[PDB]
């Protein structure tokens, strides 16, 4: 078979297989950025209430769906890769999980351009200076060229401190866990 | 080629290859293990993944561990240097004596001999056991079965055969322990060292041992039989000589095959066995054969789950054997040892034109008298012995004498009975049973015949019983 | 479903043990008698 | 939901327009391979049960045609097949060679010689999956198929075009029945009567190669290979070959049936063809039924056994007897495959081990044996003696319980027991020593007229022996008269009376 080039992050499931096929197809020939832009475009194109209502009805024949999608793709001037992907999803009847593919490829493209999603959780918000030093130290955690994608949720359930996720790495300096640890130490 | 573990479920490992896939049955080596873990490819799942069964514990495997592809099936060391050693499924030694230094490595998977290689000659192999020699005589180059449940004498009988045939056998010998107690493996190692078949000093060892006991994961039990079979095959071909091949038990091969089938995606069949039971057993039992280039005498112990001879595993195994000796628990309860069932045992050579008309007629007379005894036992349960026709009592007396006279003391069962082992030449067994049937002993009591060699020993035991009466 | 010879003692119920004992007692008695006769023959043939 | 062709390789190919350079009509690429089942992508123009050929020189039969893929069963070890291989159509359903060029040759399930005697002649080919005849070509079974066994020929007659069934346990004598039937046909094949010659086919499914080699030696010893074909599908063979071998044998026999000759095919053993089909079906993920057997297993055996016919003279008059062998377990003829094939066939020769060890070898258990064709498949002389023999044996079987008692019962039951014991000792037979019909009728006639009520039973098996030799040497004219004539004429009856009395008058 054709030795497909594997994506960086492995997505699994039906969306995973379709997205890995698309990523392998795009990586050779080199069209990942353009195909991602086209995928984002079709993200809205199909979302149109008329098109969505006409594509979620399984009683319109697959022939009509494929013809309508060919007309839409021609009317939008896509790469042959995206047009063939939409045709393939339509033939197999996998339109109801099309967004999961566009989502998957996004997750698959973000890692391609080097990104490590991050999460920070605190009892209360932060002052921008402290957020800046967090940015600096977390970028210290990463490697070379690996941009960071910070997210700062606020969880009052914890009683203070901080909780930080960098990919699968996890550091929990929250008051709640220290309280739990010390309390359990007492009871033993 | 280099691949990458992508799943670990029990003993089944899914390995993904970015380059070219390895063919089915190839051996792969996991990189990053302190010991040696070898996976064997069993399926191609598409998308470059291959499913495999691990020949060792899959503990501490990490999704992503690199894997090397050896390019050939599991290749074991073969030759005269394996004699006196012990081995795994993958051929590395487990006797703590250093590397096996051979020049030839043989793959454990091979095609069975073709039809234009079969030997069609049969000649009795005298084992020295009365019941075996009389009713189900073995044959040189033939495959022997030893069916029977648990605790009936399979291991003792096979040890007795190694004591007899193997000790005084010029050719070599191989013993494959497949999924049996490790205690027994150690006991056999030491018993051979004592006897002298395994010589730890010189290079005069006559036995090669392969072990994959019941602590091993199913992958290793399902293949240690093939490893022992490969050693035996080499000694059959290149050495061009007679070989013995003892296997204990060959039901653990089937069972180990059944412990992974459900995880390989196969629907179960029959009583929860893999769908490929008969094919998997045939592709193995068809390499244990006496071609025209050599000659393997194969003795197999076959566990029968719950004494059930109609279970799919023993039922299928029946068709691959020339001789069978169905050890029975109902006879072992009576104290008749070996508990070989005289009516449920058979042999191919048991024909008047191969053994002789005297031997054949004696055997058939014994079987007929025992069957008549069984028919009478139903009546005796209602009447009583006191109400039988004075001829029927004669049948019962002869039948009980013959039932006891088939018992024999082994040289390996000294510990249990405390008696001494006897080897009974074939002519003496035929004479003894012909006389017992002819009536030349209808005055000696039954117990005189219990656990004795030739008939004269029964006469002497009766004399002693009478003197100390 | 059929029946076969030697089935009463294959079940091993109560009739099986009863038959086993009915056989064993009788043949113990006959063994005793035969042993006595064997001793008598021994003595009478010593000379 | 999911499909097996939705793997990312196929989708990758189709996304960048690389699916147009591949001929997905007569070629395919293996998606999966495992446990002897390959799942192939493509082959859009492949017919059900057509044979495809893999790149590595192997063959396979395409059984499951699903929307996504084709399920091929490989004819050998799947060691050589790898995912991504190339599978090409052969274009033709599986067929085998046929003709007189196979006689005396051992072949495998596909007609390839395996005895190393050279290539197989083979002028004509025949598809193994051909519909049997219909209601009309056949005509009632009339001619006898001489088994050469006293019990089978006397109490369980087998005609030509009949489907008997040698059902029994393990090691009871089924293959011995088959081999004696095969060996007894030499007296007809050697002769010149062209409507009595029977050609034999022995299908050996799932037996080890040593057994088949010994069997071929046994046939050669008896000079019974020059008219025998042996089709081996031994244990080491892949499941599809064991599945097909009965059909290859049946087509090699349908050739003889169509061309006016007579054939006898011994599917030994069918309970192993059922197992091979069960494996193939379970690995193709087909829905299991009772005991894990697929739903269409009765169909599997019926479409095979319903090809044993007796064509009428407007088609040639040939015939194809079938003698399927089934190994029951404990004694359970109510299991699944025993039930199917008992409901398919026309009789059953039911063998025992109790009888085998009581000394009644062959262990044919009459009473449970039956032949729904019956007297229609017997000669007139055999009818005459066998009617009385069967009646007397039936009388003896309902008072056999008293045998141990016997004495202290009326005179009628004494006579019944005596006659029954003599008759059973008569039906005993050696091994590989079939008997011509004249010999059988002479022996049974002596037995059933009381001329052995004086002999002790232990001596009967000797009488039967010596007596037979006498007639086979001194009195050949009477035997020839009975044989050619087919009946016992009053003069021949008187001659038999005198012969039996004269020989018995001085025996001791
Ligand atoms: N009529 C007979 N007289 C003497 N011996 C017999 C007779 N029939 C069969 N035997 C012996 O019984 C043994 C078993 O017979 P055979 O193998 O034909 O039965 P089987 O059911 O085909 O065995 P399996 O089914 O296990 O292959 C053989 O060794 C054969 O020689
Ligand atoms: N020849 C014999 N004489 C006396 N007892 C025996 C003999 N063979 C086996 N046994 C009994 O059986 C037991 C061993 O059975 P074994 O053969 O090891 O089990 P299995 O056959 O299930 O592997 C011993 O404890 C012993 O009491
Ligand atoms: Mg044991
Ligand atoms: Mg047989």
DSSP string, chain A: ---PPPPSS---SHHHHHHHHHHHHHHTTT-HHHHHHHHHHHHHHTTSHHHHHHHS-TTS-HHHHHHHHHHHHHHHT--HHHHHHHHHHHHTTGGGGHHHHHHHHHHHHHHHT-EEEEEEEESS---HHHHHHHHHHHHHHS-SS-EEE--EEE-SSS-SSEEEEETTEEEEE-HHHHHHHHHHHHH-
Torsion (CA) D253, D256, D260, D266 in degrees, nearest 10: -40
| D344-358 core/surface letters (b: 16 or more CB in 10 A; e: else) | bbbbbbbbbbbbbbb
Pick from D423, D430, D424: which is nearest to D448 by CA?
A: D423
The CA distance from D276 to D206, in Å, is 9
Query: Of D63, D92, D121, at which residue does a domain stop?
Result: D92
Strands D325-327, A147-149: pairing is unpaired
Regarding whether D350 and D436 lie in a shared domain, the answer is no
Regarding whether B108 and B244 lie in a shared domain, the answer is yes
Tokens 């349908």 sit at which residue? D254
Strands D37-42, D70-74: pairing is antiparallel
Query: Of A86, A112, A138, at which residue does a domain stop?
Result: A112
The CA distance from B257 to B283, in Å, is 13
- For helices C14-46 and B357-380, angle between their N-to-C axes, nearest 10 degrees: 120
What single-letter DSSP state applies at residue B394? H
Query: Of A64, A87, A112, at which residue does a domain stop?
Result: A112
The CA distance from B174 to B36, in Å, is 24
Contact B115 D209 (CB under 8 A): yes
What single-letter DSSP state applies at residue B193? H
D286 is catalytic: no
The protein residue with its alpha carbon nearest to ligand 2, atom 26, reads B416
Residues of chain D in contact with residue A80, where contact means CB-CB under 8 angstroms, are 16-17
**DSSP element (H, E) containing D92:** strand D86-93
Q: Look up residue D440 and give its two tokens.
A: 């059988």
The C-alpha angle A108, A110, A115, rounded to 5 degrees, equals 125
Q: Look up residue B395 and give its two tokens.
A: 């049948």
Distance D497 CA to ligand 3 centre (A): 64
Q: Map residue B137 onto helix, strand or coil.
A: coil
- Choose the catalytic residue: D163, D372, D422, D483: D372
Which of D33, D71, D210 to mutate against chain B (most B CBs within 10 Å)? D210
Domain that holds residue C42: 1-47
| Pair D460, D452: CB distance under 8 Å | yes
| Pair D224, D104: CB distance under 8 Å | no
Pick from A31, A24, A35, A19: which is nearest to A1 by CA?
A: A24
Query: Which class for A58: exposed (0-12), middle (13-18), buried (19 or more C-beta within 10 A)?
Result: exposed
Q: Look up residue D446 and give its two tokens.
A: 């002596």
Q: Look up residue D220 and give its two tokens.
A: 């050669």
The CA distance from D133 to B431, in Å, is 60
Domain that holds residue B254: 74-349
User: Which method resolved this structure?
Assistant: cryo-EM
| Pair D355, D338: CB distance under 8 Å | no
How long a stretch of residues is chain B? 469
Q: Map residue B178 onto helix, strand or coil.
A: strand
Q: Map residue B227 onto helix, strand or coil.
A: helix
Query: For residue B24, how many other CB atoms are within 10 A of its CB?
Result: 25
Strands B2-9, B12-17: pairing is antiparallel
The CA distance from C27 to C24, in Å, is 5
Residues 63-122, chain A: which have Cβ within 8 Å of D? 80-81, 84-85, 88, 92
Query: For residue B12, how many other CB atoms are within 10 A of its CB?
Result: 22
- For helices A14-27 and D8-15, angle between their N-to-C axes, nearest 10 degrees: 50
Regarding whether B376 and B266 lie in a shared domain, the answer is no
Pick from D178, D179, D302, D185: which is nearest to D250 by CA?
A: D302
Strands B208-212, A169-173: pairing is unpaired
Contacts of A59 (CB under 8 A, 6+ apart): none
Q: Is D429 annotated as a binding residue?
A: yes
Give the DSSP letter string of D139-195. Answer: ----SB-----HHHHHHS--BTT-B--EEE-SSSSHHHHHHHHHHHTHHHHHSS-TT
Rg, chain C, Cα only: 18
Query: For residue B106, how many other CB atoms are within 10 A of its CB?
Result: 22
Regarding whether A93 and A37 lie in a shared domain, the answer is yes
Cα distances from A63 to residues A60, A88, A92, B170, in angstroms, run 8, 12, 11, 79
Give the DSSP letter string of D205-236. Answer: ES--HHHHHHHHHHHHHTT--TTEEEEEE-TT
Strands B49-54, B323-324: pairing is unpaired
Strands D95-98, B124-125: pairing is unpaired
Regarding whether A175 and A123 lie in a shared domain, the answer is yes
Query: Of D92, D117, D140, at which residue does a domain stop?
Result: D92
Regarding whether A99 and A146 lie in a shared domain, the answer is no
- Number of structural domains (chain C) is 1
How long a stretch of residues is chain A? 188
CA D458 to chain centre: 34
Pick from B186, B233, B282, B204: which is nearest to B76 by CA?
A: B233
What single-letter DSSP state applies at residue B23? P
- Choose the catalytic residue: B85, B130, B143, B154: B154
Q: Look up residue B393 and give its two tokens.
A: 């009592």
The CA distance from B180 to B184, in Å, is 7
How long a stretch of residues is chain D? 508
| Pair A121, A88: CB distance under 8 Å | no
Query: What is the C-alpha end-to-end distance of chain B, expressed in Å?
Result: 81
Tokens 């939705």 sit at which residue? D6
Q: Which of left, alpha, beta for B418 (phi over 0: left; psi -120 to 50: alpha)?
A: left
Contact B385 C22 (CB under 8 A): yes
| Pair A112, A7: CB distance under 8 Å | yes
Pick from D248, D284, D283: which is nearest to B279 by CA?
A: D283
Regarding whether A16 and A102 lie in a shared domain, the answer is yes
Does ligand 2 have an atom closer than 6 angstroms to the CB of B416?
A: yes
Domain that holds residue D498: 379-508
Query: What is the C-alpha end-to-end distance of chain D, expressed in Å?
Result: 85
Q: Which of left, alpha, beta for D471 (phi over 0: left; psi -120 to 50: alpha)?
A: alpha
| Pair B205, B277: CB distance under 8 Å | no
The CA distance from D504 to D452, in Å, is 8
**DSSP element (H, E) containing B51:** strand B49-54
Regarding whether D422 and D297 lie in a shared domain, the answer is no
Q: Map residue D490 onto helix, strand or coil.
A: helix
Cα distances from D81 to residues B223, D59, D78, in angstroms, run 22, 11, 5
Resolution (A): 3.2
Query: For residue C29, how many other CB atoms are within 10 A of its CB?
Result: 11
Contacts of A95 (CB under 8 A, 6+ apart): A46, A55, A56, A65, A89
Q: Is B143 annotated as a binding residue?
A: no
| Pair D395, D420: CB distance under 8 Å | yes
Torsion (CA) D254, D258, D262, D265 in degrees, nearest 10: 0
| Pair D241, D256: CB distance under 8 Å | no
Contacts of A109 (CB under 8 A, 6+ apart): A23, A32, A36
Q: Look up residue D290 and give its two tokens.
A: 């009772």
The CA distance from B161 to D77, in Å, is 36
Tokens 């004591």 sit at which residue? B163
Residues of chain D in contact with residue C5, where contact means CB-CB under 8 angstroms, are 354
Atom of ligand 2 nearest to the CA of B417: 4
Rounded to the nearest 5°, which phi and psi values hold at D330? -55, -70
Query: For residue D208, how many other CB atoms are within 10 A of its CB?
Result: 24
Residues 13-42, chain C: which have Cβ within 8 Å of B? 15-16, 18-19, 22-23, 26-27, 30-32, 34-39, 42
Cα distances from D155 to residues B210, D268, D423, in angstroms, run 55, 23, 12
Contacts of C32 (CB under 8 A, 6+ apart): B445
Ligand 1 pocket test, candidate residues D171, D350, D427, most atoms within 8 A of CB: D171
- Number of structural domains (chain D) is 3
CA B436 to chain centre: 32
Regarding whether B86 and B62 lie in a shared domain, the answer is no
Pick from D411, D331, D147, D108: which is nearest to D231 by CA?
A: D108
Regarding whether A45 and A131 lie in a shared domain, the answer is no
| Pair D12, A25: CB distance under 8 Å | yes
Q: Map residue D498 onto helix, strand or coil.
A: helix
| Pair B435, B427: CB distance under 8 Å | no
- Number of structural domains (chain B) is 3
Tokens 């393939």 sit at which residue? A88
Query: Of A75, A95, A112, at which residue does a domain stop?
Result: A112
The CA distance from B381 to B375, in Å, is 11
Domain that holds residue A145: 115-188
Q: What is the three-state SS of D330-375?
A: CCCCCCHHHHHHHHHCCEEEEECCHHHHCCCCCCECECCEEECCHH
Regarding whether D387 and D374 lie in a shared domain, the answer is no
| Pair B165, B127: CB distance under 8 Å | yes
The CA distance from A155 to A158, in Å, is 6
| B388-414 core/surface letters (b: 16 or more CB in 10 A; e: else) | beeebbebbbbbbbbbbbbbbbbebbe
Give the DSSP letter string of D399-434. Answer: SGGGGGT-SSS-HHHHHHHHHHHHHHHHH---SS--
Pick from A60, A127, A119: which is nearest to A95 by CA?
A: A60
Cα distances from B442 to residues B294, B389, C36, D32, D362, in angstroms, run 48, 16, 15, 71, 32
Regarding whether B267 and B135 lie in a shared domain, the answer is yes
Residues of chain B in contact with residue A12, where contact means CB-CB under 8 angstroms, are none
| Pair D149, D185: CB distance under 8 Å | no
What single-letter DSSP state applies at residue D54? E
């Amino acid at each position: 078979f054709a030795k497909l080039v594997r994506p960086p992050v492995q997505i699994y499931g039906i969306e995973g297989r379709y997205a890995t096929a698309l990523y392998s197809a795009a990586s050779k020939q080199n069209k990942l950025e353009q195909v991602e832009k086209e995928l984002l475009r079709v993200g809205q194109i199909l979302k149109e209430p008329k098109m969505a209502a006409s594509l979620l009805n399984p009683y319109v024949k697959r022939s009509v769906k494929v013809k309508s999608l060919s007309d839409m793709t021609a009317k939008e001037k896509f790469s042959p890769l995206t047009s063939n992907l939409i045709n393939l999803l339509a033939e197999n009847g996998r339109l109801t999980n099309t967004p999961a593919v566009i989502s998957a490829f996004s997750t698959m493209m973000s890692v391609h351009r080097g990104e490590v999603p991050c999460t920070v959780t605190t009892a209360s918000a932060l002052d921008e200076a402290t957020l800046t030093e967090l940015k600096t130290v977390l970028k210290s955690f990463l490697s070379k060229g690996q941009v960071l994608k910070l997210e700062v949720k606020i969880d009052p359930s914890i009683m203070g401190g901080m909780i930080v996720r960098i990919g699968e790495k996890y550091v929990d300096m929250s008051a709640k866990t220290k309280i739990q640890k010390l309390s359990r130490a007492m009871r033993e | 080629t280099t691949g990458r573990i992508v799943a670990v479920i029990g003993a089944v490992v899914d390995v993904q290859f970015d380059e070219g896939l390895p063919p089915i049955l190839n051996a792969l080596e996991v990189q990053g293990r302190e010991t040696r873990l070898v996976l064997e490819v069993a399926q191609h799942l598409g998308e470059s993944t291959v499913r495999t069964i691990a020949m060792d514990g899959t503990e501490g495997l990490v999704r992503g561990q690199k894997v090397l592809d050896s390019g050939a099936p599991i290749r074991i060391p073969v030759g005269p240097e394996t004699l006196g050693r012990i081995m795994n499924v993958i051929g590395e030694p487990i006797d703590e004596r250093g590397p096996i230094k051979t020049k030839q490595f043989a793959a454990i998977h091979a095609e069975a001999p073709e039809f234009v290689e079969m030997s069609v000659e049969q000649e009795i192999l005298v084992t020295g056991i009365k019941v075996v020699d009389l009713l189900a005589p073995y044959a040189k180059g033939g495959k022997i079965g030893l069916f029977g449940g648990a605790g009936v004498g399979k291991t003792v009988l096979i040890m007795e055969l190694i004591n007899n045939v193997a000790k005084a056998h010029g050719g070599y010998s191989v013993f494959a322990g497949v999924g049996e107690r490790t205690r027994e493996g150690n006991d056999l190692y030491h018993e051979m060292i004592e006897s002298g078949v395994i010589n730890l000093k010189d290079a005069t060892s006559k036995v090669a041992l392969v072990y994959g006991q019941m602590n091993e994961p199913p992958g290793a039990r399902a293949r240690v039989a093939l490893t022992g079979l490969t050693v035996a095959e080499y000694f059959r071909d290149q050495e061009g000589q007679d070989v013995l091949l003892f296997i204990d038990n060959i039901f653990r091969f089937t069972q180990a095959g059944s412990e992974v089938s459900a995880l390989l995606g196969r629907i179960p069949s029959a009583v929860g066995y893999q769908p490929t039971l008969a094919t998997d057993m045939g592709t193995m039992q068809e390499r244990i054969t006496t071609t025209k280039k050599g000659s393997i005498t194969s003795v197999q112990a076959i566990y029968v789950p719950a004494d059930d001879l109609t279970d799919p595993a023993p039922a299928t195994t029946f068709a691959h054997l020339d001789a069978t000796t169905v050890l029975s628990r109902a006879i072992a309860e009576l104290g008749i040892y070996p508990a070989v069932d005289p009516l449920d045992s058979t042999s191919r050579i048991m024909d008047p034109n191969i053994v002789g008309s005297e031997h054949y007629d004696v055997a058939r007379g014994v079987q007929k008298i025992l069957q008549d005894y069984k028919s009478l036992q139903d009546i005796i349960a209602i009447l009583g012995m006191d109400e039988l026709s004075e001829e029927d009592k004669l049948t019962v007396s002869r039948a009980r004498k013959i039932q006891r006279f088939l018992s024999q003391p082994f040289q390996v069962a000294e510990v249990f009975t405390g008696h001494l082992g006897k080897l009974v030449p074939l002519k003496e067994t035929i004479k003894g049973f012909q006389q017992i049937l002819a009536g030349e002993y209808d005055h000696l009591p039954e117990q005189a015949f219990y656990m004795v060699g030739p008939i004269e020993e029964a006469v002497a035991k009766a004399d002693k019983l009478a003197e100390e009466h | 479903v059929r029946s076969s010879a030697g089935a009463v003692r294959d079940a091993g119920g109560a009739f099986g043990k009863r038959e086993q004992a009915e056989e064993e007692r009788y043949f113990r008695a006959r063994a005793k008698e035969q042993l006595a006769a064997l001793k008598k023959h021994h003595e009478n043939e010593i000379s | 939901k999911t499909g097996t062709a939705e793997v990312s390789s196929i989708l990758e190919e189709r996304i960048l327009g690389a699916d147009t350079s591949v001929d997905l009509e007569e070629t395919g690429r293996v998606l999966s391979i495992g446990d002897g089942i390959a799942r192939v992508h493509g082959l859009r123009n492949v017919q059900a049960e057509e044979m495809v050929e893999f790149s590595s020189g192997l063959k396979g039969m395409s059984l499951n045609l699903e929307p996504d893929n084709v399920g091929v069963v490989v004819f050998g070890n799947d060691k050589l097949i790898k995912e991504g291989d190339i599978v090409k159509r052969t274009g033709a359903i599986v067929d085998v060679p046929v003709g007189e060029e196979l006689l005396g040759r051992v072949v495998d399930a596909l007609g390839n010689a395996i005895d190393g005697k050279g290539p197989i002649g083979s002028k004509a080919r025949r598809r193994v999956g051909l519909k049997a005849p219909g209601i009309i070509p056949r005509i009632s079974v009339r001619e006898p198929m001489q088994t050469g066994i006293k019990a089978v020929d006397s109490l369980v007659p087998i005609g030509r075009g009949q489907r008997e069934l040698i059902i029994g346990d393990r090691q009871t004598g089924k293959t011995s029945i088959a081999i004696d039937t095969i060996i007894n046909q030499k007296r007809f094949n050697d002769g010149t009567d062209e409507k009595k010659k029977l050609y034999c086919i022995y299908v050996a499914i799932g037996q080890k190669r040593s057994t088949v080699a010994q069997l071929v030696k046994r046939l050669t010893d008896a000079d019974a290979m020059k008219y025998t074909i042996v089709v081996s599908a031994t244990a080491s063979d892949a499941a599809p070959l064991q599945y097909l071998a009965p059909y290859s044998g049946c087509s090699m026999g349908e050739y003889f049936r169509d061309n006016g000759k007579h054939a006898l095919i011994i599917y030994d053993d069918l309970s192993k063809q059922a197992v091979a089909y069960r494996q193939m079906s379970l690995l193709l993920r087909r829905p299991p039924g009772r005991e894990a057997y697929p739903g269409d297993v009765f169909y599997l055996h019926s479409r095979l056994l319903e090809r044993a016919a007796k064509m009428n003279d407007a088609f040639g008059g040939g015939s194809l007897t079938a003698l399927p062998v089934i190994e029951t377990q404990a004694g359970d003829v109510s299991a699944y495959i025993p039930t199917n094939v008992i409901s398919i066939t026309d009789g059953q020769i039911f063998l025992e081990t109790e009888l085998f060890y009581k000394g009644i070898r062959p262990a044919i258990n009459v009473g449970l044996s039956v032949s729904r064709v019956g007297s229609a498949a017997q000669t007139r002389a055999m009818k005459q003696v066998a009617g009385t023999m069967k009646l007397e044996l039936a009388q003896y079987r309902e008072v056999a319980a008293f045998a141990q008692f016997g004495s202290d019962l009326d005179a009628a039951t004494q006579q019944l027991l005596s006659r029954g014991v003599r008759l059973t000792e008569l039906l005993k037979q050696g091994q590989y020593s079939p008997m011509a019909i004249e010999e059988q009728v002479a022996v049974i006639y002596a037995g059933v007229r009381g001329y052995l009520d004086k002999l002790e039973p232990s001596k009967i098996t000797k009488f039967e022996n010596a007596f037979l030799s006498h007639v086979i040497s001194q009195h050949q004219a009477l035997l020839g008269k009975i044989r050619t004539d087919g009946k016992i004429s009053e003069e021949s009856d008187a001659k038999l009376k005198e012969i039996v009395t004269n020989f018995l008058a001085g025996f001791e």
